[PDB]
Design a protein around this ligand. Sequence first.
Ligand SMILES: CCCCCCCCO[C@@H]1O[C@H](CO)[C@@H](O)[C@H](O)[C@H]1O
Ligand SMILES: CCCCCCCCO[C@@H]1O[C@H](CO)[C@@H](O)[C@H](O)[C@H]1O
Ligand SMILES: CCCCCCCCO[C@@H]1O[C@H](CO)[C@@H](O)[C@H](O)[C@H]1O
Ligand SMILES: CCCCCCCCO[C@@H]1O[C@H](CO)[C@@H](O)[C@H](O)[C@H]1O
Lengths: 432, 432
Amino acid sequence: CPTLIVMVGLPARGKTYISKKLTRYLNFIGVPTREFNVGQYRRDMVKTYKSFEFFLPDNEEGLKIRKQCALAALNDVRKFLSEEGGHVAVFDATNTTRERRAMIFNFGEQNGYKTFFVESICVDPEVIAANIVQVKLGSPDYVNRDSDEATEDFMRRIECYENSYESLDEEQDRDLSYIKIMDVGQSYVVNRVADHIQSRIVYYLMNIHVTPRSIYLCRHGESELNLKGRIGGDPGLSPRGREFSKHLAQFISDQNIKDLKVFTSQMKRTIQTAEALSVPYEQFKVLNEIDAGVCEEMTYEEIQDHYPLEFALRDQDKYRYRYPKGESYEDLVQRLEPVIMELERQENVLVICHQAVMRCLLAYFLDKAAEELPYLKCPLHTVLKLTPVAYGCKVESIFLNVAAVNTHRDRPQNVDISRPSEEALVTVPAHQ
Amino acid sequence: CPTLIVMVGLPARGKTYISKKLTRYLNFIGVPTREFNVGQYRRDMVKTYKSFEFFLPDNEEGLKIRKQCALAALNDVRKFLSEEGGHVAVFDATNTTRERRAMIFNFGEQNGYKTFFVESICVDPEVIAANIVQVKLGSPDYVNRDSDEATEDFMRRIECYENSYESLDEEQDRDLSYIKIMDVGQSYVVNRVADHIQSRIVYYLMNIHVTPRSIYLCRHGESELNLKGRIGGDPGLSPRGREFSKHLAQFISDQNIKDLKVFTSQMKRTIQTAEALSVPYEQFKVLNEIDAGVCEEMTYEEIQDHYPLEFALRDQDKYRYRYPKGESYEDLVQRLEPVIMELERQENVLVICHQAVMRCLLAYFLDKAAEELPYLKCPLHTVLKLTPVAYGCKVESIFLNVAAVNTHRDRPQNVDISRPSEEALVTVPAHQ
Ligand SMILES: CCCCCCCCO[C@@H]1O[C@H](CO)[C@@H](O)[C@H](O)[C@H]1O
Ligand SMILES: CCCCCCCCO[C@@H]1O[C@H](CO)[C@@H](O)[C@H](O)[C@H]1O
Ligand SMILES: CCCCCCCCO[C@@H]1O[C@H](CO)[C@@H](O)[C@H](O)[C@H]1O
Ligand SMILES: CCCCCCCCO[C@@H]1O[C@H](CO)[C@@H](O)[C@H](O)[C@H]1O
């Protein structure tokens, strides 16, 4: 049975923000999911600016439009989950009344879905006030609109929902599966989690937050096998890799960060880069570089020589196909789920890891497709500072002024199983 | 002495449209010119939506902003004409009062410029009403605004200018050089044209219009020297070039065009393509293909052999450098000025010409830079239908279902005077 997630909440209460994070997380871990924003449907259908009057409960024209947009969205939810192979559909709309919630629930019931409600409730002044500014500066609804006039207007639109608003009740809704989030990341009320997927959605939802912070991602400094153009293994740092560690410590200091937590893997290269900082670090094997199996410590030249078929097939689909006894990037994403979860929970954090591990992490926060993920650029001696925002997540690349080898291998043009070694190794950086 | 063109007129009276055409025409014929839209300066400075109230004569805040934007624009006019080498500056603003007009005139006088006024006055209902719709659908000022509210608002903004509006007078302004355009292309009043440049600006301005029509551009059908990969000459049509003429006649018919005027050059290939139509045509030598001088009828191979230096230098700057005894595209643009002027004056017109001639014409209507002009794509057996619009000019390419050779030669990567013949002729299409 597919799952219908029904958002619930007043306008500008983080309902859409949560809808996006949840869709992204579920897709990242391989659960085909799509969100359906009723407001966007309205925008696409009307194509003209609408004042708060359009949202009044007695406004017969705006009432019909919002009602047909909502039905259009639900038809699409049905198409996705019953025809397109979707597993989870996120219905993003205010859904503030019991009547409405019971209709959607019956929609799910008629289509053989399990329904689960996610209500977002803000009460924190700063959160609420900032959300309106975020809505006023980023919503397509309020473009080229006077500041005060837009604010006042949206303010009146929220009122249109507030008067008949009924939060999920402890008794009235005791037979419904749901989670109520009070001020994103602060408090929660959970009721009747029906299955494994709802259990994981709850676990994820109960661990995200909006506390201002930055995620610092960087690979260990240049290693020994790095200079040799060799992949995997357990090398130590190289002269330049040591030179980096010292630039990293200074960087971390100049940054003057509030309670920075540092993580590394069980590999000497990360650990020794961490050992150069002032602050303590924690090491985990879940953060270890992707396993190259039989191709561990080889150069690409050597891979082309002993495993030309696997090498060409990996180039064809670098996300799914693996070396014998190795891991695929798809395997790595799954291994990295507890890391994803903890990075969400953390505040200011620095992760000294590896190239493949770092690509998976960058793909998560920057929302890159599974196809592009294995090809993301994670240069040595560079710190990728990620700062989660309302729209998504900004990224700043900070080169820490130390020379290093290039380990980035572009996908070669010829990926034929019957290709010449010169064409298979054409996109390799200098090595030895 | 540089020239300051001062636009004058009510909002939505074609003032900006004329400002653009005039700047484009002057630049095309090689007179460095730039326009200065005071409304755009205001947009860039305020960066927030402004109602009609912002434009009220008693509104002390909007009065200061419009006044500093106007002075900023004039400072830039000064920088362009006195520091950047500009020849003509077009000051686009309502400039509806004598006081204002006299200030701008004194600005010109203090900076050693000759001032010339261009007033646009619409009275034709359909023109005026359509302009407001064009303004409402294309002005950045009215984005995401309610239709009726935007119209009403702009309507009130025009009122802000109408009450103190004083058109250029026959007696009051007898000492000023100017031209008053009443309903774009209908009537004109001209006073004291001071020099040659004002004389040409008047001549151009008195010949443009907004009567709905299309300009059909197409080269003669595939010729004999075309198949041989030979440039210039006076060949006749080839079997496919004849096959085209017949597709052209049918096209022109299926189009069912209102009083279509057809033009051709004094060359057999255009004339014979025209001879296949039902309608009469007129031939002019001003429409003759660019002169290749000593390289007439040669192939590129042959050019590389006898004139490798001129061939490499032409590839370096195809707009300005010419073959010995030949014309440059820059020479051709000038030769084509009477053609430009007449195409402006015409209504529905079809020009059966040549590749280089067609590039110059396409560059005019589509506003392409002099650098890009010699490289515009003008394929054989294809009709380029240009339709002048408010924003600029839309273009539709219509392939008339007849195979033909490719005569388009891209600029080769190596344009060194000391390059190998293989690298000079690398971008040549198949020929013989
Ligand atoms: C699945 C059925 C969806 C029906 C969508 C109805 C659209 C009408 O919009 C209504 O606006 C009211 C504002 O007070 C809210 O309280 C209602 O919950 C909302 O549905
Ligand atoms: C990027 C850094 C993220 C590191 C993720 C560490 C995940 C915790 O790893 C382990 O998970 C077990 C699961 O119950 C716990 O019982 C252990 O106490 C914990 O150490
Ligand atoms: C070169 C001097 C430019 C001065 C710009 C002043 C900007 C004030 O805007 C004024 O709005 C009025 C609306 O009734 C018009 O009549 C004035 O002509 C216009 O200047
Ligand atoms: C694209 C077709 C445009 C053709 C432009 C024809 C230009 C007119 O060409 C000639 O110009 C002379 C200039 O005074 C006139 O005296 C002649 O009568 C006219 O034939």
